[PDB]
């Protein structure tokens, strides 16, 4: 194959579907591109190095609501950051997992320097900025996570006797499986988002 | 050493700490426990079955703020769920990773039905009492799971924002975090049929 970085990435992201982040090795990724290890190597150090790759390349190439638009509100800023995030994360098998063993990468900084002046220029303070930002960011996080790990134990796990499951609880989990989890997110969003809006519009009161 | 369910639980959790959940396997336990490998399958059938244990039993060990007090508001009792829940996921290395997917075992179905019956009978429809039991989960994992990992130039405002959540655990973040989830769902309740 060609081996520059693309291709490399191209390659890692698919393998990374086949195998989960468990099963994806440097060994795996020589065979999947037709090269003897040493090869790899050259342009390929080691597992973290590769890791820390994908984590950048899966956003940059699907996290496409970044920044604000043109006179949109934070409101609206947060709830389409955190729906591109989560879509993002979604889009590969253990993506969230990728993500998370990562930190910001030098190409990320300034957009999310960005998105911390669009807040304190909506009237945040930069660390109340910053909590509502993070407040998102974990939200989304553990809850696409716990999505994705609970389908990658489906395999060597069994159901659950519905016979012995209590009857609030029964229904309650068929609630959860209707869907991908995307209505509880999305209404646990907007319950995140008008809580910042309370405590944005008390100032000094006692709210 | 002794092989009941509960020592070989005792020694999973050191081992945890020791090596953190990717460094933590049947060959590993069986060395701590100073026994062969075939001895410790007829206990423990492999790694998942391992986890899933681990996951209940910090929650059985540690997670004591898991039912209502008497009289209690039910912003308190998230509030104080939430705090406890946290408490539970720091005290072992990858606690949070560990609980991450599991779902309710048998012998927690009796609290956590409790949990959510109490949320409807303080005016919740059982869906939206249960997004938000589920968003304090997934709000509190998050922000539990960034803290274990990291602890595993540069524009202006971002590096004033860094050394502020460096200043503690992020303790502050979440809960402050937290109590604009609970404000958000009191305004979503009490707006009822009205458009809020
Ligand atoms: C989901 N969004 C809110 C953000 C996001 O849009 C981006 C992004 N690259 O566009 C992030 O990287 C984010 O998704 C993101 O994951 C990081 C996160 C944050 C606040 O920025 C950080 O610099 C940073 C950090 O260094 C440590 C923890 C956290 Cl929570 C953060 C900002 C996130
Ligand atoms: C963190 N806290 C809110 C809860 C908690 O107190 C639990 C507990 N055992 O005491 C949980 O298991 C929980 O922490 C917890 O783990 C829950 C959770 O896992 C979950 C899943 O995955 C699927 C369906 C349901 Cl109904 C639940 C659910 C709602 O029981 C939650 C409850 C929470
Ligand atoms: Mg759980």
Same mark, same amino acid.
Not at 135 to 151: M, N, P, R
């Given at each position: 194959?060609? $081996? ?39 342009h ?6 590769? $890791?820390?790759? $994908? ?34 994360? $979604? ?16 190409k ?24 509502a ?66 405590q ?8």
């Amino acid at each position: 194959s060609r $081996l520059n970085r693309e291709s490399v990435i191209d390659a890692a992201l698919e393998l990374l579907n086949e195998t989960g982040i468990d099963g994806l090795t440097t060994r795996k990724l020589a065979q999947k591109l037709g090269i003897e290890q040493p090869t790899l190597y050259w342009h390929v150090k080691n597992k973290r190095a590769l $890791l820390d790759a $994908l984590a950048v390349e899966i956003l940059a190439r699907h996290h496409d609501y970044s920044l604000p638009a043109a006179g949109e509100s934070w409101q609206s800023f947060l709830r389409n950051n955190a729906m591109s995030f989560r879509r993002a994360l $979604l889009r590969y098998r253990d993506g969230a997992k990728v993500h998370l063993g990562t930190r910001p990468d030098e190409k990320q900084y300034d957009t999310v320097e960005t998105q911390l002046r669009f807040m304190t220029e909506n009237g945040f303070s930069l660390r109340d900025g910053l909590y509502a930002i993070s407040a998102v960011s974990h939200f989304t996080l553990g809850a696409v996570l716990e999505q994705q790990e609970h389908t990658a134990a489906l395999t060597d796990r069994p159901a659950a006797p519905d016979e012995n499951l209590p009857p609030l609880l029964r229904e309650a989990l068929q609630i959860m499986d209707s869907d991908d989890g995307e209505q509880a997110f999305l209404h646990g969003l907007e319950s995140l988002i008008r809580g910042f809006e309370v405590q944005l519009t008390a100032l000094l009161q006692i709210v």
